[PDB]
Structures are given as structure tokens and as C-alpha cells.
Write a protein that binds this ligand. Structure first.
Ligand SMILES: CCNC(=N)NC(=O)Nc1c(CC)cccc1CC
Ligand SMILES: [Cl-]
Ligand SMILES: [Mg+2]
Length: 276
């Protein structure tokens, strides 16, 4: 009967207190065990981009380009035109300015645009950590739009957090405690729908994609979240100064709780190679 500060309300400066310098907010890939967080984030973008079989002169679309680290690796390591789209104004301005400083002989575009608006023809698509925000009632249209803008040899790499069914968690030996259910409720009131592995298969193969590979990075995310949490704790006083002890505690709770979910087996994260 009235109108009444969440983790969403934090500034980009707040995220720089605990993300690596490239501002990746998605699962890293510790290709070597002694990699730093930044090296492992680079390795995760490189892992994704390598699966696209990019050739010189192709155009690459990044759906949900975040703070731009994925397209930075694409511009630096491939001779391709890139288009990045995002619906975040902060990330749009950040990525446009970050990417403008990179030498290139190709075209580079960053747009404030959603996927349901995107009509350009592109040769390859990467989408890292954008799918989690889609509603399942939008899944079909997403894969259809992606399929239609690709050519006949088109490839797409979809990277997304995944959940398990109750039966799967049963068979796997994953016993969900009350603190796990308390945490899933916490995610409701502070963070709506996550796909299972089989869902990506269903909706991608319904849109005439073929699934050629799924790669699961469960324990890489546990390590990613562990490092994020250690960084934020190192920067606690600054985090509380920018925000509040309330917000610092919520973010630490959220990072360490998510870490626990990946470590114990409740959550996973997959890269899906889709071909046309
Ligand atoms: C939908 C857009 N978001 C992503 N794809 N991924 C994250 O939000 N990852 C993440 C998680 C998830 C386990 C927990 C704490 C903090 C972060 C990022 C800083
Ligand atoms: Cl990212
Ligand atoms: Mg992304």
C-alpha cells in the first residue's frame, strides 16, 4: 500500500571491486590450474570463440555483450567484424568506449538493442551469460531469430547457467538442505527462470539447430565465485562506502551461496555449440 535498494542498484564501480580487470561477470575457465582470474576469463572467451570457426572477414554478433571483454578478445584475436548488443545503458557506454580503443581493420559496432529487434545478417553468434534473463516463453523466438540471421554454415555458441530437475538431483546424490531452500528463496526476492540442459537441446533442436557439443564448467564457476568473494571481502570498506554494509553482506551472501551451489552439485553452467 506504499512504494519502498537491491544488489541490482550497484554501480559499475561496485563491480570493479571484485570482478577482474576485464569486468567479466560470467564463469571463468581455468584452462591451467594456476591461471589468474583475468587469464581464466580470457580463456573462457577464447574457448567460446574458438568453437565458432571464425574466418577472416566474417561478422560476429555478441548477444548481451556485457562490459565488452568477449568482443575485445574477438577483435584482438580474429580478423572479424563484430557487432555487440546489450540492453544495459551502462554496459553499452562502457563497451562502446572500451572497444573504440582497440586497433582493428574491420567494422566494430556496439548497440543498445535487444535480440528481438536484431535483423542484421551475421556469420556467427556468441551469447555468454545473457540467456539466464530470458523467460522460457521467449526461448522459441530466441532460437528462431538466431537461426534466421545465420547463413547455411552458421554456428552459435550459447553459454548459460543450468539447473537440474529434482529427479536428477536425487539420482546424482545431491541432497538439498533447508539452507539451500532458504537460499533459493533469497534469490527470488533479490534476483526468474533457469533452463536445464535438456531444455536447451529441446528448444535449439526445435529451431532446426543441431547441438554438436555441450561443455560443463561447474567447478570453474565455483572457483570464479570464490575469487569474486575474496576480492569483495578484500574491498569491503570501499564496498560499504559506495553502498552499505547491508548491500555488502547481501552480495557476499549471494556470491558464497552460489559458490556452494556449484560446489555441491545443485547448479551447473554449460557452453552449447549449435550448428545450422
Ligand atoms: C544473467 C546475467 N548474469 C550472469 N550471466 N551471470 C551472473 O550474474 N553471475 C553471477 C552469479 C551467478 C552464479 C552470482 C553472483 C555474481 C554473478 C556476477 C557478478
Ligand atoms: Cl561477461
Ligand atoms: Mg555476454
Amino acid at each position: 500500500p506504499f512504494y519502498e535498494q537491491s544488489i541490482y542498484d550497484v554501480s559499475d564501480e561496485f563491480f570493479s571491486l571484485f570482478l577482474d580487470p576485464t569486468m567479466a561477470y560470467t564463469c571463468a575457465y581455468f584452462e591451467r590450474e594456476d591461471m589468474t582470474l583475468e587469464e581464466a576469463q580470457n580463456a573462457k572467451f577464447d574457448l567460446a570463440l574458438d568453437k565458432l570457426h571464425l574466418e577472416p572477414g566474417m561478422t560476429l554478433l555478441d548477444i548481451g555483450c556485457g562490459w565488452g571483454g568477449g568482443l575485445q578478445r574477438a577483435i584482438e584475436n580474429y580478423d572479424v567484424n563484430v557487432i555487440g548488443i546489450t540492453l544495459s545503458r551502462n554496459q553499452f557506454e562502457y563497451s562502446k568506449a572500451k572497444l573504440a580503443k582497440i586497433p582493428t581493420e574491420r567494422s566494430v559496432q556496439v548497440r543498445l538493442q535487444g535480440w528481438d529487434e536484431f535483423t542484421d545478417k551475421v556469420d556467427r553468434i556468441v551469447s555468454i551469460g545473457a540467456f539466464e534473463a530470458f523467460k522460457m516463453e521467449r526461448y522459441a523466438a530466441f532460437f528462431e531469430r538466431s537461426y534466421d540471421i545465420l547463413p547455411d554454415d552458421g554456428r552459435m555458441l550459447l553459454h548459460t547457467i543450468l539447473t537440474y530437475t529434482q529427479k536428477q538431483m536425487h539420482e546424482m546424490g545431491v541432497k538439498v538442505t533447508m539452507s539451500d531452500v532458504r537460499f533459493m528463496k533469497f534469490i527470488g526476492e533479490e534476483i526468474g527462470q533457469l533452463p536445464a540442459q535438456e531444455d536447451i537441446f529441446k528448444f535449439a533442436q526445435a529451431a532446426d539447430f543441431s547441438v554438436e557439443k555441450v561443455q560443463l564448467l561447474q567447478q570453474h564457476y565455483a572457483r570464479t565465485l570464490n575469487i569474486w568473494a575474496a576480492n569483495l571481502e578484500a574491498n569491503k570498506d570501499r564496498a560499504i562506502a559506495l553502498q552499505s554494509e547491508e548491500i555488502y553482506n547481501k552480495y557476499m551472501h549471494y556470491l558464497t551461496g552460489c559458490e556452494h551451489f556449484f560446489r555441491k552439485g545443485i547448479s551447473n553452467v554449460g557452453q552449447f555449440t549449435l550448428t545450422k
